[PDB]
Each structure stands twice: as C-alpha cells, then as structure tokens.
Amino acid sequence: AYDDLHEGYATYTGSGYSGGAFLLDPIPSDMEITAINPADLNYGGVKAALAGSYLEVEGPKGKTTVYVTDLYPEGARGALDLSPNAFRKIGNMKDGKINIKWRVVKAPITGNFTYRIKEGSSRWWAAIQVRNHKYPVMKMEYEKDGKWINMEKMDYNHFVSTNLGTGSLKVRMTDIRGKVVKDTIPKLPESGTSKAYTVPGHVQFPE
C-alpha cells in the first residue's frame, strides 16, 4: 500500500559528515543525517536507490527527519546509524541502540535538482549524480538518436553510461513514486575533466 513505516534499530555515529559513500559533501555540521543499511539502501535492486533521501525516524522520545548521506555496511535490515544530534532527539544516548520506525519522506528542500558530473566524465563515459531531489531517484535516462537509454545507478550515488553522444544531453529522472521529470545538461567534455563539476538543474520532482 501507499506509505509504510519500517521497523529497525538506530545507533549513532559521527561519520557521514565527510567522506560518505554517496559523495554528497559538503554536509553542514548542524544537519541531521544517517547512514543506511545496504538491503534498504538498494531498494528495488537499484544501487544507492535511497542515497540523498530524507527519512522521518520515530524513536521512544519523539520523531525527527534525517538526510541519508552514507552506507551502513554492517547494518541489518531496517537499521540506521544516525548523527548524534538527530539521535538525541528520539532516544537516550546512554541506551546505545534504540527501537525505531522510519520511512522516506518528501525532502525539506526548495528549488531544482543540482547535477554533479564526476571527474573522468566525457562523451565516452560519464557519471552523473543528482542532488537536491525531493524524493529518491530510482531511475535516470538520456536520449540519443531518438532513443532513451537507461543509466545504471552506482554504489557511489551517480548514474553511469558510455558513448552518450555529442551535444547537449537530454535527461529524464524517475522518483520512488514513479513520477518522471525531464531536463537538459550542457555537452560533456571532449575528454575527462580533472575535477568534478556542478550543473544547476531546471526541474524538480512534483510535490
């Protein structure tokens, strides 16, 4: 059915503010964040499906919302590793591990997607990340010669393809609800950029 909660346990950690597997840096220190177990992270057989999602997390002392910035490698199904500023709002940190119920919620954000084009990217091979997205990005495609080509999502929260073609890149993104939106990204470099770079986008998933 429509919007189920997930039972699990929360622990806490100070990692994930920097060097998180989803390459979402910089994370401001006042942000409530979490790492997420692999089974839940990879919903639908899509690697990093929940990367950059937001979760409402309910514990014994209340509820709070966290930004998913990292993998919780040894986490069981249902398990989250929150930042302590988030954890304290829903449980006593003396307890170390707490019972929780969580679910994906609409991101508390404004504006459009922002894209990050990974170092190494070119017309030959590219890795494109979506940031500032209101719901998990389950799918990304690009058009080439009138056909839409699926992009595999990677563990490091970018969508990848090869031989994408020349000129501007028409892309389309699908969320966890199945809503599809469409955008354009400027032509990829002749050859691999030494640095990742940012492209502010011009669409957002519907409310």
Ligand X SMILES: OC[C@H]1O[C@@H](O[C@H]2[C@H](O)[C@@H](O)[C@H](O[C@@H]3[C@@H](O)[C@H](O[C@H]4[C@H](O)[C@@H](O)[C@H](O[C@H]5[C@H](O)[C@@H](O)[C@H](O[C@H]6[C@H](O)[C@@H](O)[C@H](O[C@@H]7[C@@H](O)[C@H](O[C@H]8[C@H](O)[C@@H](O)[C@H](O)O[C@@H]8CO)O[C@H](CO)[C@H]7O)O[C@@H]6CO)O[C@@H]5CO)O[C@@H]4CO)O[C@H](CO)[C@H]3O)O[C@@H]2CO)[C@H](O)[C@@H](O)[C@@H]1O
Q: What are phi and psi of 44, to 5 degrees?
A: 75, 15
Cα 151 to the chain's mean position, in Å?
A: 15
Q: How far apart are CA 167 and CA 105, in angstroms?
A: 36
156 binds ligand X (CB under 6 A): yes
Cβ at position 117, least distance to ligand X in Å: 12
Is-contact 145 165, C-beta < 8 A?
yes
| Partner in contact with 194, chosen from its own copies, ligand X, none, beta carbon below 5 to 8 Å by kind | its own copies
In the region spanning residues 141 to 200, those forming contacts with its own copies, defined by CB under 8 A, are 191-192, 194
Q: Which is nearer to ligand X, 4 or 74 (CB)?
A: 74
Query: Quick one: tokens of 123?
Result: 């017309």
Counting every residue, how long is the chain? Answer: 207
Cβ at position 23, least distance to its own copies in Å: 13
In the region spanning residues 29 to 88, those forming contacts with its own copies, defined by CB under 8 A, are none
110 binds its own copies (CB under 8 A): no
| Partner in contact with 38, chosen from its own copies, ligand X, none, beta carbon below 5 to 8 Å by kind | none
Cβ at position 58, least distance to its own copies in Å: 39
Q: What are phi and psi of 40, to 5 degrees?
A: -70, -40
Task: Name the β-bridge partners of 139.
Answer: 174
Sign of the dihedral defined by the CA atoms of residues 87, 92, 97, 100, in that order = negative
* Of 88, 73, 71, residue with least CA distance to 35: 71
Contact pick of 50, 71, 79, 98 for ligand X (by CB under 6 A): 71
For its own copies (CB under 8 A), the number of binding residues is 5
Which residues of the chain form contacts with ligand X (CB under 6 A)?
A: 21, 71, 73, 118, 120, 122, 124-125, 156, 162-163, 192
Which residues of the chain form contacts with its own copies (CB under 8 A)?
A: 119-120, 191-192, 194
